[PDB]
Design a protein around this ligand. Structure first.
Ligand code: MG
Ligand code: MG
Ligand code: MG
Lengths: 287, 286, 287, 283
């Protein structure tokens, strides 16, 4: 009996409510998240683009850019990884299927696909365009049919709220779930009551994207639990703090000609080694 | 056709010592460029510990490094110096393939060290190094492989802690004699030593000012007085980024919200300016 | 620094028409070089069917192609023309990244076409070609992305078979005006037709002389009389290699030994001479 | 969840000896499957010479091999045995990462050999091998790294040409004792030698029936009589494919047309059938 990351994700959902899922920009951070106690992690599409590629989150990253990060993370971290698969990386069902099979093989526990048109953008940006309900239903059907591991999770994300309104978005959500979506990700929700409306309407686990500096308030896990949201996602939180800290080191070093004044803000060598189990490896070499 | 190696050599001429900062990923390379740096570095310890979440013990492969080189140089135009450990392989063919692949991936130069196969950080105890002759062969193979004459082949020696200063300097002389264009005397403990290496080899000397190791935190003024050509800060940004990430993860887990650490975060606008986001979005909307 | 694109342009002035053969992998690129060819080709159909064992229906990713470009150009010095389909993405950003990535990978040039998604690949006759304006946008994005001025941006049009000769010529003129440096008109069946395109655009014209299709197997003499600048044989060696491989598999399975097909095999020495084996091994023996 | 290694082991019990053919790329893996084979092989000499156009001298990287494993196993369901040379690195950490990475890539098993660093074909002269103790360490590292219990760890020994039959058999016994699940005695020159290895280790034995080397072209009946469980043909199709391609290139260059060699080519309809083309288009 082989281990299923998808089965581990589903199990995590039953043990934590809402299940906190944090984005992990790279393998090192996945280990840090695990050491912090999280039971599930996330590979942000915006993070692969802005972090790994230094590019805008506008459909520029490819399937392989993402697979590279999935392998890096899952090769060392045992926590189930939910992956942002944007629109499936292609214009047809064959592309969606290749995406699902490849991510399962790379080690992911699940993925979400959204209803945006080709060159997608952040759900917290204006002027987004979405495909017809029927088109997304076909994306979803193709994804579910491609599952090689029955416990792998296929989540549907809808960006329809800001575009067509709440009722239209709920209607799409119901159609997406009827089409096979196993969990729902209603993006950029502005009021807590909306999560409850979605939850009651589709009756499958609901994910709340609590990302910073967007259209969504910073809801607490208590508030989210009261609206019956199954998981709380913090997609780029650590990434944002890491960038400010790195920027600070770069500026100080440039202005002062030494990093002495920011040593206090750095993870120590020992803390790094502890994080990656360094001593156990070096001891083996020494012997 | 633009040569990154040529740009690196040029940077050396305009700044002395030339500050070179490690960039863990493409995003940070852009932040380093915006901070004014003229050259950047791809740390082997960072590819291992950061990109792979593994110890810096010769576990990373040439391709793990090539992936990060392309990601960084595809978006950042600053010359990138790359840590190539011992050449990724048992023979001169592996060293040559490493050199040609890194040049093609967009690097400006690389350094190869004299450690045995499963190398370790120059600041760790119990290092093992190959014979002077064996290292000379690795350097000869690397130099002969250059497809871009301006690409830089830098030699690193870890012999100070293993054989002493005089032995380390003798190796450095042999390495440069064999074709190494720049020298990286690892884990120096006293400022005066940099001057001795500089005088002995007559090629640019790089001082590795990494934290929590055997080397004091020398300032650029101090390094300049010792005739150091380059001041390297390999993982400085990475160490701060890790502490900050850990803080966010801990607070979110304990508090059930990130409200209390919002002030420690780069804002969305700052991120967008960093990656030239608005230029791309404007094109799409038009 | 050597420019593959500059080498391709040079080969065009020394041979007319310039024979360009598809090379399915690095080994065959070396065989082509030994046979005397001055330029080679990375077929999109070959990357799909050969490297991935899949149909040429928009399933391959940019990275699948880049891997083959690096393998071939890392060892073979001949200029490599690459099939870049529609740019591997839905926007001008994807086209630009494809161009820059292929240049870095070592290619001498590429051709981009005017189909919608993989609709023409799927043989759909209606609404399968983008508007002239949309293709001009792809071309301008490709040309502006050139990091090496000598890299070649060729335009391929799949319109003759669906819109007629007049429309295909009109598209071709608009494409060349937008920046296309050479033209690849597909589905031509008459020599006179090649001549018409040549006079209409006044840039080098490529004739696709693939087997088992509508196009007759024109000779280089015939093509020269029609003002064709280059003759492409995209999968020729690949087709013969597959029949030979299948034969070995069949004989081995029927007989329990490969004794009877040894005479159809490249000998070990022939392989060694092709990859310069002995010069490498001797260096190892003399350490 | 399906385990490729479990499938490989099952294939052994259903075919005696099990014919394993080298598949240079995903397309040929499908050709092998369509031809009736039950197991396939990813040759290290093929990744080097074919995918990279380079000598089989330890120049290929783990990544070059992983790419080919994913391409083949993403489309072909047959269990794939992979040539892992010496583990791709200088330490047991590298051997362990190779094992884990190949399992994730989709392989059914792999073989690791006892050569020193920059290895060479087992049919080449002057090869060098590590101590029995060092090989034992590589095998222990490999077996302990298995994330799929049914993944197969095969040990290959190049000792016959260097130290003789008895020393090669002694090493083979130490390797199996260390955990090797199957054995690959390379470049055997006499049929009877296979029976000796078979009797000495009690695990499945693989015979490498490659062309133009030190091993006679033994038939599957001969191999079965010597208690050989697997018959490997690592580059057979590749060699024929190369001659065929060379012929096309030469004829086309000399004649200015490929008309005279059309009869040596797989047709487009045959190509489409081998990759299930029309099955795709319709959807
Ligand atoms: Mg996203
Ligand atoms: Mg290092
Ligand atoms: Mg081999």
């Amino acid at each position: 009996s082989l281990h299923s990351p998808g089965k581990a994700f589903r199990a995590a959902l039953t043990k934590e409510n809402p299940l906190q899922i944090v984005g992990t920009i790279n393998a090192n951070h996945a280990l840090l998240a695990q050491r912090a106690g999280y039971q599930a992690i996330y590979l942000s599409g915006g993070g692969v683009a802005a972090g790994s590629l230094g590019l805008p989150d506008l459909g520029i990253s490819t399937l392989d850019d993402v697979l590279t990060d999935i392998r890096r993370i899952t090769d060392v971290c045992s926590l189930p990884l939910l992956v942002d698969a944007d629109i499936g990386f292609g214009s047809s069902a064959f592309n969606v299927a290749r995406t699902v099979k490849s991510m399962i093989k790379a080690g992911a526990a699940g993925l979400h696909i959204e209803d945006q048109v080709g060159a997608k953008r952040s759900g917290h940006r204006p002027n987004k365009a979405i495909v017809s309900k029927e088109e997304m239903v076909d994306r979803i059907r193709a994804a579910v049919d491609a599952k090689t591991d029955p416990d792998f999770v296929i989540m549907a994300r809808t960006d329809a709220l800001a575009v067509e309104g709440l009722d239209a978005a709920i209607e799409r959500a119901q159609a997406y779930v009827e089409a096979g979506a196993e969990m729902l990700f209603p993006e950029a929700i502005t009021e807590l009551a909306m999560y409850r409306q979605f939850a009651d309407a589709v009756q499958v686990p609901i994910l709340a994207n609590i990302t910073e500096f967007g259209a969504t308030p910073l809801f607490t896990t208590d508030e989210l639990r009261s609206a019956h949201v199954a998981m709380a996602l913090y997609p780029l939180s650590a990434f944002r703090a890491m960038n400010r800290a790195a920027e600070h080191v770069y500026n100080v070093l440039r202005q002062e000609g030494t990093q002495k004044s920011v040593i206090d803000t750095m993870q120590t060598r020992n803390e790094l080694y502890e994080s990656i189990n360094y001593y156990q490896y070096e001891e083996k070499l020494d012997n």
